[PDB]
């Protein structure tokens, strides 16, 4: 309505399968502006839905670093 949210999808560095990366994104599921977080280690990739009024890659990387991993942004 007012805001317009979006999905993003990108690769992570440091995952070790076995519900590890899930913790990374579950951390982001606690960021103010996220909607959902969905991990795809079948492609060493994760997707996360957020509102770019509060939230996106800017805040996300910051937290991801503290989760103890580095995320990439595929291009741009």
Please check if 20 is assigned to a binding site. yes
1-76 folds as: Alpha-Beta Plaits (3.30.70)
Please check if 17 is assigned to a binding site. yes
Q: What are phi and psi of 37, to 5 degrees?
A: -135, 130
Domain ranges of the chain: 1-76
Half-sphere exposure of 16 (CA within 13 A, CB side): 3
Whole-angstrom distance, CA of residue 41 vs CA of residue 46: 7
From which experimental method does this structure derive? NMR
CB 60 within 8 Å of CB 71: yes
């Amino acid at each position: 309505m007012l805001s317009e949210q979006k999905e993003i999808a990108m690769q992570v560095s440091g995952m070790t399968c076995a519900a590890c990366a899930a913790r990374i994104e579950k951390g982001l599921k606690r960021m103010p502006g996220v909607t959902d977080a969905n991990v795809n280690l079948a492609t060493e990739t994760v997707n996360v839905i957020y509102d770019p009024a509060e939230t996106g890659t800017a805040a996300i990387q910051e937290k991801i670093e503290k989760l103890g991993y580095h995320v990439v942004i595929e291009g741009r």
